[PDB]
Each structure stands twice: as structure tokens, then as C-alpha cells.
């Protein structure tokens, strides 16, 4: 009956003066817009149908046309920015917020979903959705004693939409919206559905991707231990955002970073730094690099947890981008560590893979490595053992690599190397 209508038949039905004809035609639009290959979103927009769909959202007396129109609009709003905008410019935002209170769960859920698509377009629409008062009624849908009594699909949608309200930057969401959402998010993060957990992690990851005061608002809610537990989950779609959030946190103050350590994060790193997914290995190593940029007692915990050999491992063999994070981690460690910590690093075998990386054609990694080498020499000066290190560097091919880099195009590179040769190899 409503399979494969043409756009002009949809239009004819929608402009009939007959609410049931209008319902049918709307559902026909919903089915066109639901198909996998190339839903004709532009054709429906150009036929002028958005304003009619939007007025159908307000038909309380006809729940099925509210549902079909909400579903149609959700799929228009899922497309490009220009398509999401046509939905917003039709007045959809306030009309979807009013349907959040619908007694029909499947309608309320559709409105949740549509608002998530709108907010997911970017900061401006996210902030407009917020200004129109969406957060109170979204959160009231989750004001239940036990999230387990909600339908699973519905909870997941609510979680995803909330995550889109937490998204983006330039600007980040209003501080007061973040304060209002956070307690519900903390509760979703203790829920047992893997997709709610994933999306709650994603939300927390967005909220920690910012300056220290943004990180603080999250860390103060006590979530860091739960994030560490999710870090150890078997599902990759959970570990990925949990690790992004932990990483973001450790870009903050040394005290914020200490909370991550205190909660036991370092114990999961032997597995993250060997994870078969190269993106996890990369972000794990990035995260290490920010922990090795902290204080000496923090560097010591990296040492006590047995993580220096895992950094030697990733330096020795990993995807190139992960190796570049490892080089950063080593330059940070050597720049802030004690003499003893730096010696330990050499005893773990850091020099040979560091030298092997000097033949990379990435001039950033080269500077990072030269800085590390200079720092390690500086610790050896203090013990009077620059020679022993010089020999170690020469024996694995490292002197040849540094000699060459005197003739490198970049300025800091030729300088840094000239220095080392002049200072330690003449």
C-alpha cells in the first residue's frame, strides 16, 4: 500500500485535505526515506514537505502521523548539514522537544533520536537544542529508580543523544548544561549494557577534551575508577572511548593525572600497549607520554608497573604513529626523570630502537629523538659515563645516523646533531 510511492504521489496525499490520506502519504515518505540506497532526501526537501511534517508532529489527536512524521524528519536530519538545517528551519526543534513528553514511548524515542541528529550536526545546533529546553525533559525520561526497567533500544537512544549534547568544541557546551547532564551520565556509566557504556564513555571523552577546568568537572564526580574498570573491558567499542577519556584526563594537571594512577590504570597498560588494534596501541602510548610528562613520583610508578620494557617494545616495533608517541614518551621521561630513572631506561634497552628510528623521514620524530639522546647524555655526564653511552650508540649504528643528520635540511636537526657529535663523539 505505502511501498515505493513517487514523490509527487506523496505530495498529493499530504496536500489532500484528509488526515488519513495525509497519514498514508507520510508513511510512504517514511519508507522512501528509510531505504538503504540513496534515500531521496533532497527531493522530499525540494517538494516543500518539511513544514507539513513539522505541523504533523503537533497532531496529538493522531499519534501514528506524529510517529511517521517524526521518523521521516529524523532521516532528513541524519544527512548533511544543509539537510539538518532544513529540518531546523522548519521549526522542528521545539516540536520534537514537546514530543519528549508523549505518552507513546515509540514517539518519545523518535523525538529523542531526531534531537540527537540535530545536536550532532555541530556546536551551533547543539547549543540551539539546549536553548530550546531539551535537557530537562531528556533527563526526566531517565529519572527512574533502576535504568534496567527501561527498554533497551530506548535507553541506548537516550544515551547517544545525551552524548551528542556533550559533543564538540569551539565552543564546548555551556558549563551549566554540562553540570546538569553529568550526574545522569555518571549513572549511565554504571549500567550493564555494552552500547550504553560505550556511549557514556564517548560523552565523558568529549567533556574531558578541553582545558583543565573542563577535566576537573568530570574528575570531581568520581568517575575515574569506573573509567579504569571499563578500560579493562573485553569489548573494543567500550575500551576505545574509555581510553580516549583517560588519555584526555592525563593531559590536565599532575593532580588530575594522579587520580588516573591511583585508580589502577597503569596495570592495564601491558595489555593496551600490546593490543592488536593499532589505534588502541597508539592512544595507549600517547596516554603514557602524558604520564611520563608528569612528576618524578609519577615516572616512578610507570617504572614500578613494569612499563618501561613495554615502551621499549613499542619503540622497537609498532605502527609508525605509535612509534612516534613512544618517542615522545621517552623524551618526556628523559626530560623530567631522575638520573636513576634515566639509567634504568638505558638498562631496559632503549638506545638501539631509538637509534633505529633516526632513519625515519619525519623530521618531527627526529627532533624528539635527538632531544631524548641529549637528555640521556646529560644524565650520563652527571655519573661521568658519557663514554660508555657513546660506545653503546656507536656499536648499534647510531653514530652513523647522527653523522648523517648534520647534513639534514631542517635547522634544529643539523644543529642538535652537530652538537652531539662535537660534544660526545670528537
Amino acid at each position: 500500500g505505502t511501498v515505493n510511492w513517487s514523490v509527487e504521489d506523496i505530495v498529493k496525499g499530504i496536500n489532500s485535505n484528509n488526515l488519513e490520506s495525509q497519514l498514508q502519504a507520510t508513511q510512504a515518505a517514511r519508507k522512501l526515506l528509510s531505504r538503504e540506497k540513496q534515500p531521496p532526501i533532497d527531493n522530499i526537501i525540494r517538494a516543500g514537505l518539511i513544514p507539513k511534517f513539522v505541523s504533523f508532529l503537533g497532531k496529538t489527536d493522531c499519534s501514528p502521523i506524529q510517529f511517521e512524521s517524526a521518523w521521516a524528519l529524523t532521516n532528513i536530519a541524519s544527512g548533511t548539514s544543509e539537510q539538518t538545517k532544513a529540518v531546523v528551519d522548519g521549526g522542528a526543534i521545539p516540536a520534537f522537544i514537546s514530543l519528549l513528553a508523549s505518552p507513546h514511548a515509540h514517539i518519545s524515542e523518535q523525538a529523542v533520536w531526531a534531537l540527537g541528529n540535530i545536536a550532532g550536526d555541530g556546536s551551533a545546533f547543539r547549543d540551539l537544542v539546549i536553548k530550546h529546553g531539551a535537557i530537562d525533559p531528556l533527563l526526566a525520561l531517565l529519572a527512574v529508580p533502576d535504568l534496567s526497567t527501561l527498554a533497551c533500544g530506548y535507553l541506548r537512544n537516550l544515551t547517544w543523544t545525551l552524548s551528542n549534547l556533550c559533543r564538540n568544541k569551539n565552543p564546548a557546551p555551556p558549563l551549566d548544561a554540562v553540570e546538569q547532564i553529568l550526574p545522569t551520565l555518571v549513572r549511565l556509566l554504571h549500567h550493564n549494557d555494552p552500547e550504553v557504556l560505550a556511549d557514556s564513555c564517548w560523552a565523558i571523552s568529549y567533556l574531558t577534551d578541553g582545558p583543565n577546568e573542563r577535566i576537573e568537572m568530570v574528575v570531581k564526580k568520581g568517575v575515574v575508577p569506573q573509567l579504569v574498570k571499563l578500560l579493562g573491558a573485553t569489548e573494543l567499542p567500550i575500551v576505545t572511548p574509555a581510553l580516549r577519556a583517560i588519555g584526555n584526563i592525563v593531559t590536565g594537571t599532575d593532580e588530575q593525572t594522579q587520580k588516573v594512577i591511583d585508580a589502577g590504570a597503569l596495570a592495564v597498560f601491558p595489555s593496551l600497549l600490546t593490543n592488536p588494534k593499532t589505534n588502541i596501541q597508539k592512544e595507549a602510548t600517547w596516554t603514557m607520554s602524558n604520564i611520563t610528562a608528569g612528576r618524578q613520583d609519577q615516572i616512578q610508578q610507570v617504572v614500578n608497573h613494569g612499563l618501561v620494557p613495554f615502551l621499549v617494545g613499542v619503540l622497537s616495533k609498532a605502527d609508525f604513529k605509535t612509534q612516534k608517541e613512544a618517542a615522545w614518551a621517552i623524551t618526556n621521561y628523559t626530560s623530567g626523570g631522575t638520573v636513576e630513572q634515566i639509567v634504568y631506561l638505558v638498562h631496559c634497552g632503549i638506545i638501539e630502537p631509538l637509534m633505529n628510528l633516526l632513519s625515519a623521514k619525519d623530521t618531527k620524530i627526529i627532533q624528539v629523538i635527538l632531544d631524548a639522546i641529549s637528555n640521556i647524555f646529560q644524565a650520563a655526564e652527571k655519573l661521568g659515563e658519557t663514554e660508555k653511552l657513546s660506545i653503546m650508540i656507536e656499536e648499534c649504528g647510531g653514530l652513523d645516523k647522527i653523522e648523517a643528520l648534520q647534513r639534514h635540511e631542517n635547522e634544529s636537526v643539523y644543529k642538535a646533531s652537530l652538537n652531539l657529535i662535537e660534544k660526545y663523539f670528537s
Binding site: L33, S34, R35, E36, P39, W71, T74, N75, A77, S78, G79, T84, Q110, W113, G116, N117, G120, D121, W160, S163, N164, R167, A198, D199, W202, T240, P241, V250, T251, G252, W286, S289, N290, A293, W328
Partner: peptide
Amino acid sequence: KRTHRAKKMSKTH
């Protein structure tokens, strides 16, 4: 210190 979830989703069924 140095600084994947779909933005939008269409409903098919």
C-alpha cells in the same frame, strides 16, 4: 603535555 562515534544516524527499520 600534548592534546569515531557516528554524529548522526538514520533509522532504517
